[PDB]
Amino acid sequence: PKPAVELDRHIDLDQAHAVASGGARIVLAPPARDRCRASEARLGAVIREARHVYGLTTGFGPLANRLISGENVRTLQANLVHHLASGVGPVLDWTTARAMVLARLVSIAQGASGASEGTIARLIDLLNSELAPAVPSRGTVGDLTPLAHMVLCLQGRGDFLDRDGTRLDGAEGLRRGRLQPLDLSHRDALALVNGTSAMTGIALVNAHACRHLGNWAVALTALLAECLRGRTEAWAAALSDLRPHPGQKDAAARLRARVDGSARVVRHVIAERRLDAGDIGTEPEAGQDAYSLRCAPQVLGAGFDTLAWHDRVLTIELNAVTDNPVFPPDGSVPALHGGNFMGQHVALTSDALATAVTVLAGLAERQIARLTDERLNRGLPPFLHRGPAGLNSGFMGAQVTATALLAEMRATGPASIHSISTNAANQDVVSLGTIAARLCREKIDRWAEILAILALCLAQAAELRCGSGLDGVSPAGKKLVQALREQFPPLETDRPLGQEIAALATHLLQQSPV
Amino acid sequence: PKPAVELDRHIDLDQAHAVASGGARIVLAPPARDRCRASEARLGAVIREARHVYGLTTGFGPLANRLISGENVRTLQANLVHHLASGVGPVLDWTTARAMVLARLVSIAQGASGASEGTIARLIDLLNSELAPAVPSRGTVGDLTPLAHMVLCLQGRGDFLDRDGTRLDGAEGLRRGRLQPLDLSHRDALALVNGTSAMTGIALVNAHACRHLGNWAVALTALLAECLRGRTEAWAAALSDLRPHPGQKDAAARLRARVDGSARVVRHVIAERRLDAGDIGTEPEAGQDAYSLRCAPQVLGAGFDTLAWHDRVLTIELNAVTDNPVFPPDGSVPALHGGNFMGQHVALTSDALATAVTVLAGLAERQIARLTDERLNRGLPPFLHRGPAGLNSGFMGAQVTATALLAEMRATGPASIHSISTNAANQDVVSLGTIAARLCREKIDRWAEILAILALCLAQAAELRCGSGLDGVSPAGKKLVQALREQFPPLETDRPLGQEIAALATHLLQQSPV
Amino acid sequence: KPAVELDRHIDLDQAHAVASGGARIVLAPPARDRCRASEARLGAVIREARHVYGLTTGFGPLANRLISGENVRTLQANLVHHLASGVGPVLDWTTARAMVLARLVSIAQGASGASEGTIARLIDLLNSELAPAVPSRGTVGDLTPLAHMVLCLQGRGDFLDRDGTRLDGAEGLRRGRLQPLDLSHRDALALVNGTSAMTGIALVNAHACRHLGNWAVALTALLAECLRGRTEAWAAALSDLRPHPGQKDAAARLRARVDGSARVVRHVIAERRLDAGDIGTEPEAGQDAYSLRCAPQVLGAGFDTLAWHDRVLTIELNAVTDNPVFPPDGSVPALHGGNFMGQHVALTSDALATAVTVLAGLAERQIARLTDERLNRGLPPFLHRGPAGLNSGFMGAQVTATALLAEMRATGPASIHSISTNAANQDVVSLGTIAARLCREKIDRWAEILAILALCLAQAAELRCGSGLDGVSPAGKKLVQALREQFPPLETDRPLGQEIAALATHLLQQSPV
Ligand SMILES: O=C(O)/C=C/c1ccc(O)c(O)c1
Ligand SMILES: O=C(O)/C=C/c1ccc(O)c(O)c1
Ligand SMILES: O=C(O)/C=C/c1ccc(O)c(O)c1
Known part of the structure; x- marks a missing residue:
C-alpha cells in the first residue's frame, strides 16, 4: 500500500519529504485534531467579542490603522488574497509546492492559528492527492504572495500541477483530485496566508x-x-x-x-x-x-x-x-x-x-x-x-x-x-x-x-x-x-x-x- | 511584404534583431557570395596541399598534437560535433537561438571561414523560416557546445522550436520549415562550430x-x-x-x-x-x-x-x-x-x-x-x-x-x-x-x-x-x-x-x- | 593577572583572554608530559629514518624528492624561507597572538613532536606584551603567516607592541625577554602547519x-x-x-x-x-x-x-x-x-x-x-x-x-x-x-x-x-x-x-x- 505519516506535534525532515513527494499519505492525530478544534473556537470568540486583531478588524500592513467593521470581514479577507496574488515567474515544482502546503499545515497543527476543520481538511486532501497547486516562484520578500496563490488554487481559481508538471485548470484539479473548494467563511484566511x-x-x-x-x-x-x-x-x-x-x-x-x-x-x-x-x-x-x-x-x-x-x-x-x-x-x-x-x-x-x-x-x-x-x-x-x-x-x-x-x-x-x-x-x-x-x-x-x-x-x-x-x-x-x-x-x-x-x-x- | 536585409559585410544591431525575430528576411549580397565562394576554394586548396591546419589535419584541444590523415577527416569532424554536444539546461528562446545562427553567418560572410555554399544556404534557410534550432543554454565557457547542438539540429538530429517555443523533432523541423539536411562533406564543420x-x-x-x-x-x-x-x-x-x-x-x-x-x-x-x-x-x-x-x-x-x-x-x-x-x-x-x-x-x-x-x-x-x-x-x-x-x-x-x-x-x-x-x-x-x-x-x-x-x-x-x-x-x-x-x-x-x-x-x- | 592553564581544552573566552593579554598562559603538567612523549616519538621517527613529509622529503609536489638526514636542517630552514612571501597590512596585535595561541593549543594535544624549547618560545610570546608582525595576505588556507611568525621568533622579523608600534627583531627579543627560536630538533613542521x-x-x-x-x-x-x-x-x-x-x-x-x-x-x-x-x-x-x-x-x-x-x-x-x-x-x-x-x-x-x-x-x-x-x-x-x-x-x-x-x-x-x-x-x-x-x-x-x-x-x-x-x-x-x-x-x-x-x-x- 502506502506509508502513513500521523501528524501530531513533531514531524522530521524525512517524513516531511515523504509526504511532499507523495511517498506517504498524511493523517492528523486525534490530539492535534482536538487542539485545532479548540483553537477554532478561540477564533470564533475573538471575532464575536470584536477584539482588536490584525486581519479580523483591521486593514493590512500600514493600513492596519484602518479599523474594519465585523460586517465587512468576508470582503476584507477576500481582498487580502486578491491584492497578494501578484506573483510572477516559473511555478514551484510539484514536490516543492506541496512542501509549502505541508509547512503551513504543520504550523496550523500546533493549534494556535484558529483554522477551521474544513480548512485543515482541504490542505490534508491536497497532500493526499496526486496534485500540487501551481504557484509562481517570485514575489515574496519572505511568504504571503505564494500562499495567496495557493489559496486561489484550492478555491478552484488557480491552476494545479500533476507529478509531471502539466497544468490543470482549477475546476479540473478539484475534480480529478476529489478536492472540495476551499471555504473561508469562518474568517480563518490568515491561517492560510501567513508564516x-x-x-x-x-x-x-x-x-x-x-x-x-x-x-x-x-x-x-x-x-x-x-x-x-x-x-x-x-x-x-x-x-x-x-x-x-x-x-x-x-x-x-x-x-x-x-x-x-x-x-x-x-x-x-x-x-x-x-x-x-x-x-x-x-x-x-x-x-x-x-x-x-x-x-x-x-x-x-x-x-x-x-x-x-x-x-x-x-x-x-x-x-x-x-x-x-x-x-x-x-x-x-x-x-x-x-x-x-x-x-x-x-x-x-x-x-x-x-x-x-x-x-x-x-x-x-x-x-x-x-x-x-x-x-x-x-x-x-x-x-x-x-x-x-x-x-x-x-x-x-x-x-x-x-x-x-x-x-x-x-x-x-x-x-x-x-x-x-x-x-x-x-x-x-x-x-x-x-x-x-x-x-x-x-x-x-x-x-x-x-x-x-x-x-x-x-x-x-x-x-x-x-x-x-x-x-x-x-x-x-x-x-x-x-x-x-x-x-x-x-x-x-x-x-x-x-x-x-x-x-x-x-x-x-x-x-x-x- | 516582409522586409529584406541584404548582408554584405556590415549589419547593425537593429537589422540583426529584425532578422533574428523574423521581422525581416536575409539575403547574401553578390559580393559576399563571391567572397565566400573564394574562401570555400581556399579551404579546398589547404586540404589538397595537406597544410598543417587545426581540425583538418589535427585533433582538437590538447589533442591537436595528434596529426590526422586526410582519409579520416570526415570522421574527425563528425566526432567533433559529437563530443561537444554535452549541453544542458533550458533551451535558448526562439529569437536568441536564431540570433546565434545569424552571428555565425555574419562571421562567415566576411569570407575567411571556408564555409561551402550549401552550409551557408542551410543557415540562410533557417533564418528565413519560422523555426529556430533547440539548443541547451548551458555548457560553454565562452561557444562550441551550443553551436554543436545547432549543427545536429540542422542535420535533423536535434529538435527545433516554433515561435511559441513548442518543440518539434528533427524530422518535423526539416519538413515544416522546408529545410535541407546539413551536409558537411566539404569538411567545413569548423565554420559552424566556432567563435x-x-x-x-x-x-x-x-x-x-x-x-x-x-x-x-x-x-x-x-x-x-x-x-x-x-x-x-x-x-x-x-x-x-x-x-x-x-x-x-x-x-x-x-x-x-x-x-x-x-x-x-x-x-x-x-x-x-x-x-x-x-x-x-x-x-x-x-x-x-x-x-x-x-x-x-x-x-x-x-x-x-x-x-x-x-x-x-x-x-x-x-x-x-x-x-x-x-x-x-x-x-x-x-x-x-x-x-x-x-x-x-x-x-x-x-x-x-x-x-x-x-x-x-x-x-x-x-x-x-x-x-x-x-x-x-x-x-x-x-x-x-x-x-x-x-x-x-x-x-x-x-x-x-x-x-x-x-x-x-x-x-x-x-x-x-x-x-x-x-x-x-x-x-x-x-x-x-x-x-x-x-x-x-x-x-x-x-x-x-x-x-x-x-x-x-x-x-x-x-x-x-x-x-x-x-x-x-x-x-x-x-x-x-x-x-x-x-x-x-x-x-x-x-x-x-x-x-x-x-x-x-x-x-x-x-x-x-x- | 589571571592565568589560563592549558591542558587539552580551552574555551573561546579563555583563548581571547590570553590573546588580548588579559591573562597569562601556563601549560599544565599533563600537557607538558604528552608533549615530551611526542618529542621522543619524533626523535625515534628520525632515528629510524621513517619516510615522513618534511623530515625525509621536499615540500608540496617536491615531496617526491627524498632527503638525506644530514640535510634536514637546511631543508626546514628553506621551508620557512620560501614560505615567507606574505604581503599586506600586518595582522593586529591581538589577532597575531591569537594565531600563536592556536598553534600552541594544537601542539599541546601531543601529536606534533614539538620540543620543549619550541613550546616555551610560544608560551613566552603569549606572556609578553608583544606579538609577531605578520603580513595578512598570502595564504590559501596557513603556512605563509606562520613562516613569518617563525622568522619573527628567531629575531629575523618585526614585532608589534600593544599599540601596534613596530620593533625590529633584535629589539623585540630584548624588550619581550624572548629567546631566539631554535629548530635544531627538526620540529619546524610543528610551527608551520595547520x-x-x-x-x-x-x-x-x-x-x-x-x-x-x-x-x-x-x-x-x-x-x-x-x-x-x-x-x-x-x-x-x-x-x-x-x-x-x-x-x-x-x-x-x-x-x-x-x-x-x-x-x-x-x-x-x-x-x-x-x-x-x-x-x-x-x-x-x-x-x-x-x-x-x-x-x-x-x-x-x-x-x-x-x-x-x-x-x-x-x-x-x-x-x-x-x-x-x-x-x-x-x-x-x-x-x-x-x-x-x-x-x-x-x-x-x-x-x-x-x-x-x-x-x-x-x-x-x-x-x-x-x-x-x-x-x-x-x-x-x-x-x-x-x-x-x-x-x-x-x-x-x-x-x-x-x-x-x-x-x-x-x-x-x-x-x-x-x-x-x-x-x-x-x-x-x-x-x-x-x-x-x-x-x-x-x-x-x-x-x-x-x-x-x-x-x-x-x-x-x-x-x-x-x-x-x-x-x-x-x-x-x-x-x-x-x-x-x-x-x-x-x-x-x-x-x-x-x-x-x-x-x-x-x-x-x-x-x-
Ligand atoms: O506589517 C504587517 O504585519 C503586514 C505587512 C504586509 C505587507 C504587504 C502586504 O501585501 C500585506 O498583506 C501585509
Ligand atoms: O585550444 C583549442 O583551440 C581547443 C579547445 C577545445 C576545448 C574543448 C573541446 O571539447 C574542443 O573541441 C576544443
Ligand atoms: O601537499 C602538501 O601537503 C604541501 C603543499 C605545499 C604547497 C606550497 C608550499 O609552499 C608548501 O610548503 C607546501
Whole structure:
C-alpha cells in the first residue's frame, strides 16, 4: 500500500519529504485534531467579542490603522488574497509546492492559528492527492504572495500541477483530485496566508536533495581513488579523531566503507617504510595525493556540518508556528501580535548551505578536471576516450561543461544581504528567505549535473583502468558502475552526452548509490 | 511584404534583431557570395596541399598534437560535433537561438571561414523560416557546445522550436520549415562550430530589449513627475551642458519631451523668486524633489552610456570573424591560428550592462516605493487603492513584489571574474561570455517586470490625481495611459495582478511607449 | 593577572583572554608530559629514518624528492624561507597572538613532536606584551603567516607592541625577554602547519560579535524607549511558538533591557474590544515596523549563526590541524593526510559574515527610522538641537551609516573562489583565512554603524524624556549616562567622525552592563 505519516506535534525532515513527494499519505492525530478544534473556537470568540486583531478588524500592513467593521470581514479577507496574488515567474515544482502546503499545515497543527476543520481538511486532501497547486516562484520578500496563490488554487481559481508538471485548470484539479473548494467563511484566511511556508518548503526539498548528492559525492570520491591508485591513509579514523568535526569523521568513515574490499587503492602507511642511503633520490610520485583526494574528508565534512546546521534550524522552523497574529492555547490573552513570520533563519541557513554546495561542486569539478587530464590521471587516455585518439575526444566536451556549470554557480551569492525597506517603510527589514532557498536550489541542481558528469567519467575510467570486468574494484564500486551501465552505455566512440548528463542528474537528486 | 536585409559585410544591431525575430528576411549580397565562394576554394586548396591546419589535419584541444590523415577527416569532424554536444539546461528562446545562427553567418560572410555554399544556404534557410534550432543554454565557457547542438539540429538530429517555443523533432523541423539536411562533406564543420556566436546572439537580443526598456524608464519617470507635481528645472538642458555626458544629455532631453504640454508638472525655477522677511520659516515642501525624480537624468544617463559602450563593442563583435583557424582572403598564408574565439569583450560588456540594468531597476523600484507611500505621494491614496481603504489595499502586494524582484537581481554578480583553468589546463583562462550575457538577460527580464508594475501604478495614479479624463496630463502621458487601459482595466477593487504584470512585461521588452 | 592553564581544552573566552593579554598562559603538567612523549616519538621517527613529509622529503609536489638526514636542517630552514612571501597590512596585535595561541593549543594535544624549547618560545610570546608582525595576505588556507611568525621568533622579523608600534627583531627579543627560536630538533613542521591564522582571526571575530550583539540588543531596546515601541512583540509566548534558541534569547534579553521602563507600550492590543463608533482611521497602527517588531527574529537568526560558528571554531581551536602527525598510541610512526584544510573556518566565517551584514542592516534601518521626522513620532528631524535648518544634527552621520552598510554588502563569501594551485597539487583550497578576514572587516563596519546608532539614541532619549531621562528604564539610563561620560550631547552641529570611530572601538571590546 502506502506509508502513513500521523501528524501530531513533531514531524522530521524525512517524513516531511515523504509526504511532499507523495511517498506517504498524511493523517492528523486525534490530539492535534482536538487542539485545532479548540483553537477554532478561540477564533470564533475573538471575532464575536470584536477584539482588536490584525486581519479580523483591521486593514493590512500600514493600513492596519484602518479599523474594519465585523460586517465587512468576508470582503476584507477576500481582498487580502486578491491584492497578494501578484506573483510572477516559473511555478514551484510539484514536490516543492506541496512542501509549502505541508509547512503551513504543520504550523496550523500546533493549534494556535484558529483554522477551521474544513480548512485543515482541504490542505490534508491536497497532500493526499496526486496534485500540487501551481504557484509562481517570485514575489515574496519572505511568504504571503505564494500562499495567496495557493489559496486561489484550492478555491478552484488557480491552476494545479500533476507529478509531471502539466497544468490543470482549477475546476479540473478539484475534480480529478476529489478536492472540495476551499471555504473561508469562518474568517480563518490568515491561517492560510501567513508564516514562512514557501521558503520552508523549498528548503526541506533542498535538504533531501543534498543528502542524496552528498552520498554521491562520497561514492564518486571513493571510486576516483580506485581509478587513480589513491592513498587510503589520508582517510584514516585516527586523523578524524585528531580534528573531531562530526561531519569530517562521518565523511572519512563513509569513504573508507566505500573502498572496503578494493585492491585498486594504496593502503600502505608511508611512514612505516624505513629509508636507507640507496633510497635518497627522486621517486616517480609523491607520497601523498593531491587535495581533491587527500582532503576529501575535510572538504566534504565541512559541507556536511553546514547541512547539519541547516537541518537543525529547519526542523525547528518546520514544526513552529510562524503565524501572525496567533491565538495562545492557554487562553492567557485573546491573541498576540508579533513577527514570527520573519524568515531570517531559513534565509541565513539557505545562504550558508548555498556556499557549501558551491564548494562541494567545485571539488567534484576539480575531480573531473584531474581524472580527464592525461598528465595527471596516471596513465589513463586523454579525456578517457576510446577509439583512435584525435579522431575521438571522449569526455573533452563534458569536462568543460562541468567547469561552465560551476562558474555559473559562483556568479550568484547570498540573498540575505539585500534587504530593502519596502511596504511604505513598514517592512523596513525583510529576510528574503524564499529567494535564498530558491538560489540554493539552483546551485543544488548544478551540483547534481556536475556529479553526473563525474559519475559517467568514473564509469568509463574504471573500465579503462581495470577492464570491463572491473578487476580489483571494490564491491561497492562494482555495484555503482554496474548500476550506471544498466542505463548508460560505455563511450566506445564519441557521442552527444547532454541528454544522458541531464537524465543522470535527475536520478542523483532522488536516489543514493547503494 | 516582409522586409529584406541584404548582408554584405556590415549589419547593425537593429537589422540583426529584425532578422533574428523574423521581422525581416536575409539575403547574401553578390559580393559576399563571391567572397565566400573564394574562401570555400581556399579551404579546398589547404586540404589538397595537406597544410598543417587545426581540425583538418589535427585533433582538437590538447589533442591537436595528434596529426590526422586526410582519409579520416570526415570522421574527425563528425566526432567533433559529437563530443561537444554535452549541453544542458533550458533551451535558448526562439529569437536568441536564431540570433546565434545569424552571428555565425555574419562571421562567415566576411569570407575567411571556408564555409561551402550549401552550409551557408542551410543557415540562410533557417533564418528565413519560422523555426529556430533547440539548443541547451548551458555548457560553454565562452561557444562550441551550443553551436554543436545547432549543427545536429540542422542535420535533423536535434529538435527545433516554433515561435511559441513548442518543440518539434528533427524530422518535423526539416519538413515544416522546408529545410535541407546539413551536409558537411566539404569538411567545413569548423565554420559552424566556432567563435562567439551564442554570447553575441544573446547580447544582441539584450541590446534590443534594453533600448525599449530604457524608453519605458524615461516615459514612466516623466509620468511620475506628472503624478507628483515634479519640478522640471532639474531636467533643464543647461544642467546637461554643465556635465556633458551624452547619455545624461539624452536622458534629460527625452524627459523634457515626455512632459511637454503638461500642466501637472512645476516649471518655475525656484531661484527666480525673491524672498522677503515674512517668508522665513518652514514651507510645506522643499524646493527640490527626491532623487528618484531630480537625479533621473544622471542615473538614467549613466545606464544609457553603459548601453552605448556595450553596443559599440557588440557591433564590432557581430561583424567580426571570431573563428579559429581562419583563411586569409588576401592569400598571404594558407591559414592563421590564434584565439579570436575568446569572448572577453562580450563578457565584460555584458557584466557592465547587467550592473547598469540593476541600478536602473533600482531607480524604478524606488519610484514605485515613493508613489505608493501615502506619506510621500503628496495626497494620493495609500498604495493607490480605490474603494474603501483597508478593505482594499490596491498595489500593496505588487509594490513588495517589485522589491523582491530587485533583491533577487542584486544577488547575482558579474560572470567574468570566475574564470577557471579547464580542458587539461589548455584553456587556462576562459571568458564565460555566454554566461555573462545570459545573467544580464535574466536581469533585463526582472527589470521589465518592475517597470510593468510601475506602469500599472502610474496609470492608476494618473487617473486618481487628474481624473479619468487625465486633465492637465501631457499628450505623451495621455497616450501611454490610454494605450495601457486598452488592455489593462483600472483597479477599482483589489484583484490578482500577477498575470497582468507578466503580460505587460512581455510587451515592454518588445515595444516602446509611442 | 589571571592565568589560563592549558591542558587539552580551552574555551573561546579563555583563548581571547590570553590573546588580548588579559591573562597569562601556563601549560599544565599533563600537557607538558604528552608533549615530551611526542618529542621522543619524533626523535625515534628520525632515528629510524621513517619516510615522513618534511623530515625525509621536499615540500608540496617536491615531496617526491627524498632527503638525506644530514640535510634536514637546511631543508626546514628553506621551508620557512620560501614560505615567507606574505604581503599586506600586518595582522593586529591581538589577532597575531591569537594565531600563536592556536598553534600552541594544537601542539599541546601531543601529536606534533614539538620540543620543549619550541613550546616555551610560544608560551613566552603569549606572556609578553608583544606579538609577531605578520603580513595578512598570502595564504590559501596557513603556512605563509606562520613562516613569518617563525622568522619573527628567531629575531629575523618585526614585532608589534600593544599599540601596534613596530620593533625590529633584535629589539623585540630584548624588550619581550624572548629567546631566539631554535629548530635544531627538526620540529619546524610543528610551527608551520595547520589552520592557526584563520582560527586566531576567527576567535577574535567571535569575541567581537558577542559584544556587538549585546549592543545590538541594548540599542534596539533603547530605540523602543525612544519610539514608544510595543513590548508584546517581544513576549516569551511568541518565542515558545517558534523555539529558535537565538530568538528566545534575543527576546528575553530585549524584555530585560526595557524592564522598569515607562516609555514603552505594554498593552496587548487584542485585549481591546471595538465598538461601531471606533471604526475609521486611527492615528497609529497597532503594531510597530519590523526594525522593532521583528528584532527577536532578525537578531535571533544572527545569534544562532554565531552559535554554530562558535561550536565549529571551538572544535577547530582544540584540534590538531597538523600534517604530518605522530599518533600518541604508537600505532603507526606517522600519519599523512589533510587536517590543514581549513574548510570549516571558511564556511562558518562566510556564514557569520552574512549574518553580520544582516544585523548591521537592521541597525542601519533603525537609525534611518529614528532620524526621520516623518517616522520618529514627534522627534526633531535628524535629532538636531538649536534652530532647525541652521542645524542638521545627525543628518550626515545617518548617511555615513548607510555608506558603511552599502560597502559591507559589496563583499561576498570567500570560500567559493577556490582555484587549483601549487602545480595542481592543491587543486582545491579553503581560503578560510581570507574568509575570516573579510568577516572581521564587516564586524568593524557593524561596530561603526552601532556607534552611530548609540550616539543618535543618547540624543533621542534626552529629546524625548528630557536630560533626566524620565520614564527610561534603569538599563537604558545607565547606558546613556555611561555614553555621556565621554560623549557630550549634540546641542549644536559639530564633527562626529572622530567620536564615531572612538565609540566603535569601545563597542568591540565591552558590552552595556
Ligand atoms: O506589517 C504587517 O504585519 C503586514 C505587512 C504586509 C505587507 C504587504 C502586504 O501585501 C500585506 O498583506 C501585509
Ligand atoms: O585550444 C583549442 O583551440 C581547443 C579547445 C577545445 C576545448 C574543448 C573541446 O571539447 C574542443 O573541441 C576544443
Ligand atoms: O601537499 C602538501 O601537503 C604541501 C603543499 C605545499 C604547497 C606550497 C608550499 O609552499 C608548501 O610548503 C607546501
